[PDB]
A paper describes a structure:
Using our platform, we screened β-catenin at multiple concentrations, and in the presence and absence of an Axin-derived Helicon (which binds β-catenin as a short α-helix) and the β-catenin-binding domain of the TCF4 transcription factor. Analysis of five β-catenin-selective binding clusters from this screen revealed two types of binding behavior: binders that competed with both Axin and TCF4, and binders that competed with TCF4 but not with Axin. Unexpectedly, we also observed clusters whose patterns of conserved residues resembled the conserved residues in other clusters, but were in the reverse orientation (N->C vs. C->N), for example C32 and C33. The implication of such “flips” is that a similar binding mode is achieved from a Helicon whose N- and C termini have been inverted relative to the other clusters, and that the side chains are able to form similar interactions, despite a different presentation angle from the main chain of the Helicon. Finally, we noted that the conserved residues for several of these clusters, such as C31 or C32, bore close resemblance to the α-helical sequence in Axin that is known to bind β-catenin. This suggests that these particular clusters, identified from an unbiased α-helical library, represent a rediscovery of a naturally occurring α-helix binding site and binding mode to β-catenin. A cocrystal structure of β-catenin with FP01567, a Helicon from C33 that was predicted to be a flipped version of the natural Axin sequence, confirmed this binding site, and also confirmed that this Helicon was indeed able to achieve a similar binding mode as Axin but with an inverted/flipped N-to-C α-helical orientation and thus sidechains that were projecting from a different direction. The crystal structure with FP01567, combined with an alanine-scanning analysis, further confirmed the importance of the conserved logo residues.
To target disease-causing proteins that are inaccessible to small-molecule or antibody therapies, we are exploring the use of a nature-inspired drug modality that exploits the intrinsically favorable properties of synthetically constrained α-helical polypeptides (Helicons). Here, we report a rapid, high-throughput screening platform utilizing phage display that enables an unbiased mapping of the α-helical interactome of a given protein without any prior knowledge of its structure or known binding partners. Analysis of 14 high-resolution crystal structures of Helicon–protein complexes across six different protein domains reveals a range of binding modes, all of which are “side-on”, i.e., mediated exclusively by Helicon side-chains rather than involving main chain amide interactions. Biochemical and structural experiments demonstrate diverse functional impacts by the Helicons which bind these sites, including inhibition of protein–protein interactions, inhibition of enzymatic activity, induced conformational rearrangement, and induced dimerization.
Residue numbers in the entry:
A (entry chain F): 3 to 15
B (entry chain A): 147 to 548, 561 to 663
Write the structure that this text describes.
Amino acid sequence: HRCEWAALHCELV
Amino acid sequence: ELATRAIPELTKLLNDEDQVVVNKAAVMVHQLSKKEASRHAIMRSPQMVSAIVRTMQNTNDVETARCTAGTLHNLSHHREGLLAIFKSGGIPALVKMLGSPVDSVLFYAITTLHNLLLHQEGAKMAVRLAGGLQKMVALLNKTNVKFLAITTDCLQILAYGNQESKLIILASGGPQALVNIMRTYTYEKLLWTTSRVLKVLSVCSSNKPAIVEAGGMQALGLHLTDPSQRLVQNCLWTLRNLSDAATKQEGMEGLLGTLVQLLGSDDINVVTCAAGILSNLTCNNYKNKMMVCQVGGIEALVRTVLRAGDREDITEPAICALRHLTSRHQEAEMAQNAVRLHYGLPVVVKLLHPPSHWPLIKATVGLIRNLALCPANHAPLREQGAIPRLVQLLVRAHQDTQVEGVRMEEIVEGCTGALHILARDVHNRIVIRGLNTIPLFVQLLYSPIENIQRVAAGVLCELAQDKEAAEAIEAEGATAPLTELLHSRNEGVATYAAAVLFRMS
Ligand SMILES: *CC(=O)Nc1ccc(NC(=O)C*)cc1
């Protein structure tokens, strides 16, 4: 968790 | 430098009418947003952010909409960048871009909107005001599961603690699209995030039927075996919310078998949720009562009560589930004997002892009344000491009526009802008489509640076949209220009242 949305944001864009 | 000329000049070029000039500037602005030194000078110029926001809406060049949206996504990684996007009318623009056919623009918009919802205050009100909730629900038809996980988290941030956002999601067809996500995909982060949205939408009574009729109960039960602990937990919480408003739903078979097997989990919180769902699903549903007994639900629930000990958050739903299973279905006699055959009577009677509270005591008494219907339980219930406590709880409830959300008359009706059925055994009546219960039962004939009158005359009718007992009842002056209860419109009260009067002679 924690900065787990930033890693997902990075792989998508 | 930069702030003095380059950015003012780039701002001037970014809002030129020559589309080729705008596209050339947008590419340079996108490149400047990739390093801390120049990116800082962009967010410190509200004139530049405004030009990027307006260009992103009005342009018809895909490469420019990609560069402007990709720019805004780069400023959204820190505090003052999010505030510059917020104050420059960026949120209504990013909501407009959610209807873009370009995937790069759509992904840049949903990630920038997600960053704003996570760290920028005032963004929840702005996204709702700009119609963001509707556009997000319509995007659940997309197949990119990484995009779906972000879109569902935005809905969860908007819907948590906000009735307007919940109602908008339900009105736009939200539940059907979310249930289909749990039904189709296997990506853990998407399934976990979607379950948190279904959990928020299930905490209200009038909003639950939408998730149920769409097949949400079965779709959530699919992932109770998944290795993700946070996914199983959110599925069990949502199922427990939906359960009490879905006790009439068809096709709960496969879910009930999984819930029974979850009672063997090492996670105490998983066993607690599973017991609470089985309690709600088995209430007044003879089909759910059947399938649970066919998969070994009695042994698993009796084993659960033992494991819990004095943890009333586990014993109460487990005892309530056992009370449901032991009444009003084909295999009711099977469930009543099964509680004995799997060694449940000692811990059931023990739960009448302190330190149990009233909600657990009320549920335990109702189960004993059901178990007393089986004749093979008359002696084991007596030899475990159930009669002396059923009387002692009855005396305590009579003093506070002659608490903790429990009406003390339901305790009086329940305790006397168990003694009324236990009195079918000869040896039981010897114990019930030896505790000075006949005077108390006579005073219960004056109760204004019919069901208490029916059970008081019922236990007096059972005790009256002992000749010396019929005289003690007559000596306590029961003839006067019994003759009154003869004229009762309730046939059950008048039937037992005539029986005592007949046996007193
Ligand atoms: C904590 C943190 O900053 N994590 C993080 C993860 C991933 C990325 N980006 C990519 O993997 C492309 C950035 C930061």
